[PDB]
Amino acid sequence: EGLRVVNLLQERNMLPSTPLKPPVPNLHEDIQKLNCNPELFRCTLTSIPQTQALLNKAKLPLGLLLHPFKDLVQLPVVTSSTIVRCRSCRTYINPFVSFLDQRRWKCNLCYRVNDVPEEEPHRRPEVQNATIEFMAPSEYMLRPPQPPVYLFVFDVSHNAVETGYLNSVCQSLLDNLDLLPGNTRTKIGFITFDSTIHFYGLQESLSQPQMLIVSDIEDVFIPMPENLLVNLNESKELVQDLLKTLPQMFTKTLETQSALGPALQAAFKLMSPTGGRMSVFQTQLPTLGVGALKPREEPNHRSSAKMTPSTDFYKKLALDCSGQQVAVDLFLLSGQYSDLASLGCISRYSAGSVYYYPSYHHQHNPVQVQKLQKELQRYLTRKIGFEAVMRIRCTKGLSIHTFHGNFFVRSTDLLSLPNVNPDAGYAVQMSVEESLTDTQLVSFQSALLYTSSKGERRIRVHTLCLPVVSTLNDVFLGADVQAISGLLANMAVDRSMTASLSDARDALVNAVIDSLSAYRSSVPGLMVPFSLRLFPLFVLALLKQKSFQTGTNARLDERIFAMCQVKNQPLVYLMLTTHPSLYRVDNLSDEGALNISDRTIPQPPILQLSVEKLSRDGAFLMDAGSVLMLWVGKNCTQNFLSQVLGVQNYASIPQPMTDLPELDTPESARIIAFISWLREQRPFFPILYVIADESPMKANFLQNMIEDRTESALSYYEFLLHIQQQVNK
């Protein structure tokens, strides 16, 4: 612990060898113990500024980061014939309510006092679980629970046929047809497209599927009432064949153009009636019909900081899906610019999610291929909610004034979520509308109203209670750097679209300066509170990530996807991404977590992001959350190549190496033991590649040593040096 000040200029080794743990709100031992899980609900200031003035004086942003539908281990399910809720602000009776007349309860959010209905009340599960899930009553639905409908929309143009993604995508569906979320009411559908929209009907009465083609691009329509969206259960055999055929129907195609717009417009109309999930796969820039985008020239490391969408079409179409509880997930496997800065909008406002795969090719990029294999595996077998919505409430005086995430904000905080995934992240920014002089505790509650794949209406609520403070140092003592960082990120993304990448970048540098600069006018070197010791380190890495970096040869579509991830990713993976974890692995040992019964699991220490830490004499794994990159030294140890890599010498370490071998060696067991534990800490299986040779021309590994200097960026010390110069100007 510690209320110590730190001089960033003399330490230079502040980053701990163990994972960082989320702060603990300064709260009475008994309340904190019932507090929500931080991995689900968390605040930037565990210590809430009693007043806005105090909030500003700190110069830190006040907001929340949530991951509500996240996969849980033990989820309490209340089937209460009635849901207990405050008659004024409609807050879900939670663990942080104040019980008095033991037959009445004071709403912790708007202080009104409610009458406990005749249905030890404080022992009721509703008030012993911060994270709970209620069964929605007949009033909580505007229509029979809609069934699960999955419509895939493939782009079958020439380019698209050349990448050969269609093949794997279909094998996945096939291997995971049975594993799709849903009862017997499950509906599935398909549509292909190039210059025309290709529908496919499936009746058990006909010898083979029927490809129905719409060619009037300026006026689409559905070709058949029935059979286009079939009943998986009944039609299993039928669909199974279609998947085994499609990849083969377009091998000698000469269609260069692709009218994605119309396709989607038809995609929409088919779903319109039921709503459901629209999985769209695209591979190039849209050039036919509406939704058409003009090509653009990719920037080089030379051009300065001089993003937004080319047209509104995809956004407009999105709200429409949204109003139909239709969600669109974008899978881009383009090899050239494709204008994601505008395509993304399709998924951004429909609470969908975009998946990117740069230069996807069945033969030419064995990496992306697996990445996809594995991200589809996820996307396909993970739980899903339908026609859901979310509201976030917070104690009187506190106000959410800005949202971050893929959803549509109807009337303040009725976030419409056409679809809800357990990988979707969200953030919010609040301010003090009224001074918290009254209370000494404020709570936040988010309810997730939705429809399970099993046709059940359900609410998922999380509730968080924190303490109000009235002195700077306090605000500072409970600061959560990580969260401040990720929240700033989202504000920056928006900052860039609203203005420019420059301002975005700057405002990020000013958060650090205006902050520590405020800390000083309130206390030689760069002096900061123990909690913000990693504040400049994270913003820097923030400025060097592919979402804000500048001096690089970064292509448009990439930058955009990067900011798409900041926007739709749960703090934890924004960190992994932004600040990979570097572990030296050629010498793992026994200080491991050899607890897990028969497996030991080494616990090597986390290194800071710099080449000064690497060593030609060894191997270093870098965990970036989505992928694991094993860089290897030229002068490595023989033992490592032979007993871990399965090779006789550095020179014969296969160029692209997609995964280590499972050799009968204790060195193998150890490295495989470590790697296995890492991926078990997440649902999205991260690929791993050792291709990181010292000459595989895939050493983008180095792009992560955020602490060194570059011809176009400052070093950590260089950054610290700059900050201090402004802190005391």
Binding site: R85, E139, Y140, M141, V389, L414, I459
Partner: peptide, 6 residues
């Protein structure tokens, strides 16, 4: 407004 049910 299914959540707030007001």
């Amino acid at each position: 407004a299914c959540e707030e049910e007001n």
